[PDB]
Amino acid sequence: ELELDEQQRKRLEAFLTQKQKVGELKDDDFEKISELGAGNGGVVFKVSHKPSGLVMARKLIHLEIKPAIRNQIIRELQVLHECNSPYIVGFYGAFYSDGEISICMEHMDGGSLDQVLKKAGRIPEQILGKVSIAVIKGLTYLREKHKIMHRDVKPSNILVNSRGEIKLCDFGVSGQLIDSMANSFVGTRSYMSPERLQGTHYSVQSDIWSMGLSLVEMAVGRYPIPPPDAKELELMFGCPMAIFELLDYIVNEPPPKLPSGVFSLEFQDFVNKCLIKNPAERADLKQLMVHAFIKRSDAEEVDFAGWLCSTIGLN
Numbered sequence: 001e002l003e004l005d006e007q008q009r010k011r012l013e014a015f016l017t018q019k020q021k022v023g024e025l026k027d028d029d030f031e032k033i034s035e036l037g038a039g040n041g042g043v044v045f046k047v048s049h050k051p052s053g054l055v056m057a058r059k060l061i062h063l064e065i066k067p068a069i070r071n072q073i074i075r076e077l078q079v080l081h082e083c084n085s086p087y088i089v090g091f092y093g094a095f096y097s098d099g100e101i102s103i104c105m106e107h108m109d110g111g112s113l114d115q116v117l118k119k120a121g122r123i124p125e126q127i128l129g130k131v132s133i134a135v136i137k138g139l140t141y142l143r144e145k146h147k148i149m150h151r152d153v154k155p156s157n158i159l160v161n162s163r164g165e166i167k168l169c170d171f172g173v174s175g176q177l178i179d180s181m182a183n184s185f186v187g188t189r190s191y192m193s194p195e196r197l198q199g200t201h202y203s204v205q206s207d208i209w210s211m212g213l214s215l216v217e218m219a220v221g222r223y224p225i226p227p228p229d230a231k232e233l234e235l236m237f238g239c240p241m242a243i244f245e246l247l248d249y250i251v252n253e254p255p256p257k258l259p260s261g262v263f264s265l266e267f268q269d270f271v272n273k274c275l276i277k278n279p280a281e282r283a284d285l286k287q288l289m290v291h292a293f294i295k296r297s298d299a300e301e302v303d304f305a306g307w308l309c310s311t312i313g314l315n
């Protein structure tokens with residue numbers, strides 16, 4: 001499942017070739033085009049790398065720290081230069097300047113799935129079939145080629161583009177950045193597995209739960225916890241809990257599931273196997289790769305780019 005198409009292979013090749021001409025990234029070499037979005041930790045701008053004329057997505061993390069620490073983070077991020085896959089957002093480089101860490105990556109014109117969802121209302125099962133394939137393959141690539149696990153799978157961390165590509169981003173690679181950022185910068189735990197929320201076991205199985213939860217949210221058009229009422233579902237398809245309470249609910253209540261009747265039994269079974277509370281019983285990457293839903297989706301000819309462009313008004 002890590003084999004590359006001819007089109008994919010050619011695209012990866014082209015990306016590196018361009019990346020080759022870039023050189024050392026410097027603060028003054030960038031011109032801001034617009035703000036792509038913000039989160040807990042930093043802001044992401046669409047930028048122009050003046051010298052190369054290349055457009056990039058520049059993530060700025062404001063962190064006041066000493067040269068020692070800063071220089072450590074920058075070193076850890078260098079590993080991102082090794083993560084090359086059609087399912088991982090391209091990396092250009094990282095540097096520090098004027099009290100802010102910069103992470104420059106490939107620009108994904110379709111934005112994140114959380115932004116796409118807001119606009120679509122809800123995402124069709126067939127489209128989610130392609131999203132599932134991409135996430136599984138992205139997690140597989142990270143585990144296999146880098147012995148890395150994502151740790152932060154969620155809709156805002158799944159990027160898409162007008163070329164119909166779906167890629168993962170923001171997978172923890174720098175312990176230092178996490179530490180220093182663990183200060184005023186702390187992301188949502190609402191997609192974390194029950195086991196991770198209990199300081200218990202935590203491997204790639206944890207990422208599979210996050211994916212399963214993200215898929216349900218996208219299919220129904222709302223963060224699925226707690227479960228919707230027969231009345232909401234009725235308005236949804238015709239057919240406020242505090243963070244700490246939400247986390248307790250996740251750990252103590254049964255996992256969410258898709259509503260029946262509206263989705264295929266195969267899709268329902270797929271998410272169910274991703275959402276089994278017990279990580280030992282929960283399906284693994286290898287099993288998911290051959291799941292009926294995945295096999296069916298893979299063989300389907302879905303024009304993701306077309307659906308995407310018309311959905312968000314791209315163009």
Ligand SMILES: Nc1ncnc2c1ncn2[C@@H]1O[C@H](COP(=O)(O)OP(=O)(O)OP(O)(O)=S)[C@@H](O)[C@H]1O
Pocket residue numbers: 036037038039040041042043044057059089105106107108109111112114115156157159169170186187188
């Ligand atoms: N390469 C990229 N191309 C296009 N848009 C991007 C890219 N990277 C990030 N974005 C957008 O920028 C938004 C903010 O990114 P982040 O700073 O990582 O925050 P977040 O992931 O939304 O939330 P946190 O920080 O994890 S709580 C994302 O949700 C995307 O919409």
Ligand SMILES: [Ca+2]
Pocket residue numbers: 027028
């Ligand atoms: Ca400057």
Ligand SMILES: [Mg+2]
Pocket residue numbers: 039156157169170
């Ligand atoms: Mg992110």
Ligand code: NA
Pocket residue numbers: 027028098
């Ligand atoms: Na600057």
